[PDB]
Amino acid sequence: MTRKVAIGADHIGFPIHESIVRYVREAGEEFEPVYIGPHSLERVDYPDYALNVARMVARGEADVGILVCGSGIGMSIAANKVPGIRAALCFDHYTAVMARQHNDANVVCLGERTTGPAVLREIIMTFLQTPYSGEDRHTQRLEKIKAAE
Amino acid sequence: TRKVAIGADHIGFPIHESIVRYVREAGEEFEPVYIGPHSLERVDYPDYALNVARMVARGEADVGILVCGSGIGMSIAANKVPGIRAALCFDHYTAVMARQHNDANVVCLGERTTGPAVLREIIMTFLQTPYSGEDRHTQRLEKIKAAES
Amino acid sequence: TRKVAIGADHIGFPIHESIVRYVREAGEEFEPVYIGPHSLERVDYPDYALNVARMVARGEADVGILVCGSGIGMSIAANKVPGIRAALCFDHYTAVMARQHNDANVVCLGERTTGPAVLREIIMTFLQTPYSGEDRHTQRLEKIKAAES
Amino acid sequence: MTRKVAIGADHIGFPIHESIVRYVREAGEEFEPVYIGPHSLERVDYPDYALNVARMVARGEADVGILVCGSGIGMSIAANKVPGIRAALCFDHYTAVMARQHNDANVVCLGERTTGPAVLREIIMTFLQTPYSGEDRHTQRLEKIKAAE
């Protein structure tokens, strides 16, 4: 039953990584977070952490990914370059629901500079708890994304 | 002249004429090229995402705009194309930073989430905002490129 | 039965039928009462704000919904009425908290800012969410009441 | 030329008050902030600080007010109870512009739990720098709000 959630940031996300770890662990009994870095305020490059989490998720070393930078945008661009990854920029409850229900997203990308802590919590909770719809019309869309990889 | 390829799905279709008009309001140099769909028929967002994205990546167009319900499926699909940096934007800030930091070449928008005046703001801002030119973002962007091989 | 007085200006007018429908989707107990405007003619938001607000404050209606471009003018005008707690909401979270903490009796919405599925989410959430009942919010709310004299 | 900006919070806003003070002082040469409290994490009641700032602004002891709670909603409800106050809940650049340009808002209300720091900065900058439109159609709306006081 344990679902490991790999969490990655840059130095802009770094200052809130502890809260992200908690929001995961409190989202449900089976979710366990693994924070992969970085470990200081030293400037680093978001794609290195994006790609490390996305590759973990793609290989089945983690079930879900969470990435945090200033806006979430760079993380979502980088992570989507990994085959098998569907990385969703979410900024509210509605987008979190749709990312899962329609896109079966396996990575959620968030902006520390844009979205406040209770909303980041709610996004994470929602993303981890919402199932994929299972419907044919969505699946056919997802197969076209996988063909393009 | 900057050619702006515009794509939607059926969910974004009903507002596509307003999107074309927002592009022309961003300035006289912008030439919108709306590539479909041209009716209310249900279609698959990735066909239109990948179409706009491929155009921009091949240099058939300078910038892309993708409109679906939330923006997320468009951003996931577009980013599968090498050379593409597709940014889901939902406000002025994210539109600025997608350009300034990520040199984003495709903006992805949600017709179900984001109201018309904000969509207009985002499009104008996205088209008018330059890349900051800073080497630390450039190195990040080179890392994303390297992950595409 | 809960009567839901609904007001707009000319900017909110074009979506008022969707707002009425979102109210009926929130549950069978909700009865929408749309009080105008009934055409595209330019009107003054405060006339409709104060009208909905006065209805709710006098107990002619249980809840109010006000729609203008951004929500802001509606919230400023409605809150001038004693007994009114009008909340500008733009997502699920704010819709929850307006109810749970502020026991808000009027929700104010922006047709220009917020997309249709989020407006629907907000309305449903606002109508379905109860006040938390906590005494520390009640004391706050009594302080607002005291400032109205 | 000095424009004093009175800033008030509750204990939920308290942890970011320093950043708010800076965002004001850096918004323009003439703006100077005055933080009125609270001064700890001890729980307090948002209406007491809302009403103190709003009354400062209403009496001409400060030119503009800023209020910060979890969502901004309680602050905007309370502050609007003071005659001469037009208190706008803002959550992005667009709402900040409209609050000033259309509503001539003199108080801006913000949510620490909802909106991230770079957006809070941008809202403040925009709110302080944007003039009122001066137009008759807006002024007639504002006179109707003042009649209701």
Side-chain angles (χ1 to χ4, degrees):
Chain A
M1 293 300 154
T2 302
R3 307 222 308 128
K4 298 196 213 173
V5 182
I7 297 164
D10 63 1
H11 55 286
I12 303 308
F14 168 77
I16 69 162
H17 81 274
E18 162 285 315
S19 79
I20 305 293
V21 165
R22 281 194 284 107
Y23 302 162
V24 172
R25 190 163 59 234
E26 299 177 353
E29 73 187 4
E30 69 273 45
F31 304 107
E32 296 301 335
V34 180
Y35 176 62
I36 58 122
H39 303 297
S40 83
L41 297 165
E42 187 158 318
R43 287 181 286 265
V44 295
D45 293 334
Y46 67 85
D48 290 329
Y49 292 91
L51 291 167
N52 183 312
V53 165
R55 293 177 182 146
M56 291 175 71
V57 171
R59 296 188 209 103
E61 304 163 46
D63 276 29
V64 187
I66 303 176
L67 294 169
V68 193
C69 78
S71 71
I73 296 167
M75 295 294 201
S76 69
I77 296 163
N80 278 310
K81 301 309 186 177
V82 179
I85 298 303
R86 295 182 299 285
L89 196 288
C90 298
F91 61 92
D92 77 340
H93 165 80
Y94 180 88
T95 50
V97 172
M98 298 298 108
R100 294 295 302 119
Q101 191 180 109
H102 293 190
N103 306 107
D104 193 28
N106 51 16
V107 182
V108 61
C109 299
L110 309 166
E112 176 283 337
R113 295 317 278 173
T114 55
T115 309
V119 176
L120 287 166
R121 177 177 208 124
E122 185 187 50
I123 290 159
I124 289 163
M125 165 205 79
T126 306
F127 190 91
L128 295 173
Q129 295 169 8
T130 301
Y132 175 44
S133 75
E135 301 190 80
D136 291 340
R137 69 192 178 268
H138 300 311
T139 303
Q140 167 170 313
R141 296 155 185 163
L142 301 183
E143 280 160 10
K144 284 168 180 178
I145 292 163
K146 180 179 183 177
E149 300 171 328
Chain B
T1 299
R2 320 279 324 307
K3 296 207 215 210
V4 179
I6 307 162
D9 70 357
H10 57 282
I11 302 305
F13 177 77
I15 62 156
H16 81 275
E17 292 173 0
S18 70
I19 302 306
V20 176
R21 186 192 330 129
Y22 305 153
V23 172
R24 299 196 133 280
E25 292 189 82
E28 285 229 298
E29 75 272 41
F30 303 107
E31 186 63 41
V33 186
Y34 183 62
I35 57 66
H38 305 288
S39 86
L40 271 175
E41 264 299 335
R42 297 178 45 245
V43 296
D44 293 343
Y45 68 83
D47 291 321
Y48 296 88
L50 290 162
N51 201 107
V52 170
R54 284 172 180 146
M55 286 177 69
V56 172
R58 286 167 189 165
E60 302 167 1
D62 304 295
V63 190
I65 296 166
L66 299 171
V67 187
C68 72
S70 82
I72 293 163
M74 288 307 201
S75 86
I76 290 162
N79 281 131
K80 299 303 183 168
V81 187
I84 294 312
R85 293 180 304 278
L88 199 160
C89 299
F90 63 81
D91 78 332
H92 183 261
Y93 179 87
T94 49
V96 175
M97 299 315 286
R99 291 293 306 119
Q100 283 271 109
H101 286 187
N102 309 106
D103 195 17
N105 53 17
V106 178
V107 61
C108 302
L109 305 172
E111 177 278 338
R112 294 326 274 169
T113 48
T114 306
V118 178
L119 289 175
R120 170 173 184 284
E121 184 189 49
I122 289 157
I123 284 158
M124 295 179 66
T125 301
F126 193 83
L127 291 174
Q128 286 178 4
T129 303
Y131 178 55
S132 81
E134 302 161 277
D135 194 54
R136 85 187 166 289
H137 306 308
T138 299
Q139 283 183 216
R140 289 158 196 168
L141 297 184
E142 296 162 352
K143 292 174 174 188
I144 292 177
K145 188 170 163 192
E148 293 170 340
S149 339
Chain C
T1 299
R2 320 279 324 307
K3 297 207 215 210
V4 179
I6 307 162
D9 70 357
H10 57 282
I11 302 305
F13 177 77
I15 62 156
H16 81 275
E17 292 173 0
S18 70
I19 302 306
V20 176
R21 186 192 330 129
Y22 305 153
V23 172
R24 299 196 133 280
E25 292 189 82
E28 285 229 298
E29 75 272 41
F30 303 107
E31 186 63 41
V33 186
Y34 183 62
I35 57 66
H38 305 288
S39 86
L40 271 175
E41 264 299 335
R42 297 178 45 245
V43 296
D44 293 343
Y45 68 83
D47 291 321
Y48 296 88
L50 290 162
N51 201 107
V52 170
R54 284 172 180 146
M55 286 177 69
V56 172
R58 286 167 189 165
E60 302 167 1
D62 304 295
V63 190
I65 296 166
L66 299 171
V67 187
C68 72
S70 82
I72 293 163
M74 288 307 201
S75 86
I76 290 162
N79 281 131
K80 299 303 183 168
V81 187
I84 294 312
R85 293 180 304 278
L88 199 160
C89 299
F90 63 81
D91 78 332
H92 183 261
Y93 179 87
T94 49
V96 175
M97 299 315 286
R99 291 293 306 119
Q100 283 271 109
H101 286 187
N102 309 106
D103 195 17
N105 53 17
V106 178
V107 61
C108 302
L109 305 172
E111 177 278 338
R112 294 326 274 169
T113 48
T114 306
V118 178
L119 289 175
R120 170 173 184 284
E121 184 189 49
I122 289 157
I123 284 158
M124 295 179 66
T125 301
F126 193 83
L127 291 174
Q128 286 178 4
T129 303
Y131 178 55
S132 81
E134 302 161 277
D135 194 54
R136 85 187 166 289
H137 306 308
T138 299
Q139 283 183 216
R140 289 158 196 168
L141 297 184
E142 296 162 352
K143 292 174 174 188
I144 292 177
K145 188 170 163 192
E148 293 170 340
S149 339
Chain D
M1 293 300 154
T2 302
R3 307 222 308 128
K4 298 196 213 173
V5 182
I7 297 164
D10 63 1
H11 55 286
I12 303 308
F14 168 77
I16 69 162
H17 81 274
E18 162 285 315
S19 79
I20 305 293
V21 165
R22 281 194 284 107
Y23 302 162
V24 172
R25 190 163 59 234
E26 299 177 353
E29 73 187 4
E30 69 273 45
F31 304 107
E32 296 301 335
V34 180
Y35 176 62
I36 58 122
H39 303 297
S40 83
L41 297 165
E42 187 158 318
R43 287 181 286 265
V44 295
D45 293 334
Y46 67 85
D48 290 329
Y49 292 91
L51 291 167
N52 183 312
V53 165
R55 293 177 182 146
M56 291 175 71
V57 171
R59 296 188 209 103
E61 304 163 46
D63 276 29
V64 187
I66 303 176
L67 294 169
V68 193
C69 78
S71 71
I73 296 167
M75 295 294 201
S76 69
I77 296 163
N80 278 310
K81 301 309 186 177
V82 179
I85 298 303
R86 295 182 299 285
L89 196 288
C90 298
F91 61 92
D92 77 340
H93 165 80
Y94 180 88
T95 50
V97 172
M98 298 298 108
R100 294 295 302 119
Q101 191 180 109
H102 293 190
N103 306 107
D104 193 28
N106 51 16
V107 182
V108 61
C109 299
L110 309 166
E112 176 283 337
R113 295 317 278 173
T114 55
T115 309
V119 176
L120 287 166
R121 177 177 208 124
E122 185 187 50
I123 290 159
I124 289 163
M125 165 205 79
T126 306
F127 190 91
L128 295 173
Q129 295 169 8
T130 301
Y132 175 44
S133 75
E135 301 190 80
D136 291 340
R137 69 192 178 268
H138 300 311
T139 303
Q140 167 170 313
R141 296 155 185 163
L142 301 183
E143 280 160 10
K144 284 168 180 178
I145 292 163
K146 180 179 183 177
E149 300 171 328

